[PDB]
Ligand binder design. Structure first.
Ligand SMILES: Cc1ccc([C@@H](NC(=O)[C@@H](F)c2ccc3c(c2)CCCC3)[C@@H](C)C(=O)O)cc1
Length: 293
């Protein structure tokens, strides 16, 4: 599964306004590469990778000239350092979560103005088409999404009235969502990823405070267990997994837009500061793929 030359890509984000940055971190030498800007600035987007291509999904352009929720899907090819537009989603989705199953991108939840989506749709890259699938049991903006064992998990978020500790799982062969065990902590805007047999939820916002706590859901035992907390509390953070470790990037803590990047080692149950982003920002999309040419 591991291979050389993979970078952690961070796209978009927010600081004073929505951002167009695409930057890639190399854990093997600690360097950051500045790559081609997004065609449209966006925060609250999600990033994912299919077939070596990086996709930026949804979000919102918060600019001095207005606030526009995004239905856009855009594809970055590291071999060309170019972004290419794809077919748009059926609805704008800010503060979205995405997951990849069998080469298809699932776009989950998000907001459009005051509308809080429970709807979900799936993108087929070979056909460049989106199609709706079964909606979630709960409306979720700021939802964390991860895929484990070809099952799709939607974790936490905000339904428009309450931030959520609930979570649910999508079973593709049944086109059905079912609730799973609720988290120990209410979390909107948490970083959600998969490591070994567990879904991790790191940080987020409980309606009062941004969080440094981290918990993981064992899909076998169906229990949530706290692990070591991050050094810096953060919500609306970027997250990914690389070579058996969790990386959290940026976010907002109620006082600062963080540039901090922390790395979690599950064998030692410890977080370590590895690098800083070029500037502090929240609401980024993050994914791992091969380095550009
Ligand atoms: C991508 C994303 C996901 C979830 C959120 C949630 N909010 C936070 O997580 C909150 F902690 C926060 C975070 C960033 C910022 C602020 C406040 C205020 C200043 C601007 C940046 C939203 C749904 C909520 O629960 O209301 C926001 C954004």
């Amino acid at each position: 599964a591991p291979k050389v030359g993979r970078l952690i890509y961070t796209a978009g984000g927010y600081f004073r306004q929505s951002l167009s940055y695409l930057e890639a971190y190399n854990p093997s030498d600690g360097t950051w590469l500045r790559l081609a800007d997004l065609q449209v600035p966006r925060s609250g987007l999600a990033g994912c990778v299919v077939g070596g291509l990086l996709y930026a999904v949804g979000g919102r352009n918060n600019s001095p000239d207005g606030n526009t929720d995004s239905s856009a899907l855009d594809c970055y090819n590291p071999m060309t350092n170019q972004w290419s537009p794809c077919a748009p989603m059926s609805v704008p989705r800010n503060r979205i979560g995405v997951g990849v199953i069998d080469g298809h991108i699932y776009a989950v939840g998000g907001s459009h103005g005051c509308i809080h989506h429970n709807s979900v749709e799936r993108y087929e890259p070979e056909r460049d088409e989106w199609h709706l699938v079964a909606p979630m049991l709960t409306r979720r903006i700021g939802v964390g999404v991860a895929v484990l064992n070809r099952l799709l998990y939607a974790v936490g978020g905000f339904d428009g009235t309450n931030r959520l500790n609930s979570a649910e799982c999508y079973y593709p062969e049944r086109n059905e969502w079912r609730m799973i065990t609720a988290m120990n902590t209410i979390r909107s805007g948490a970083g959600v990823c998969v490591l070994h047999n567990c879904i991790y939820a790191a940080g987020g916002y409980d309606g009062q405070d941004q969080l440094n706590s981290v918990e993981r859901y064992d899909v076998e035992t169906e229990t949530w267990t706290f692990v070591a907390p991050m050094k810096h509390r953060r919500s609306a953070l970027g997250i990914t997994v690389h070579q058996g470790r969790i990386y959290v990037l940026g976010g907002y803590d109620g006082h600062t837009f963080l540039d901090s990047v922390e790395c979690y080692d599950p064998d030692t149950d410890t977080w370590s500061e590895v690098t800083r982003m070029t500037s502090g920002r929240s609401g980024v999309g993050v994914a791992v793929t091969m380095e550009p040419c």
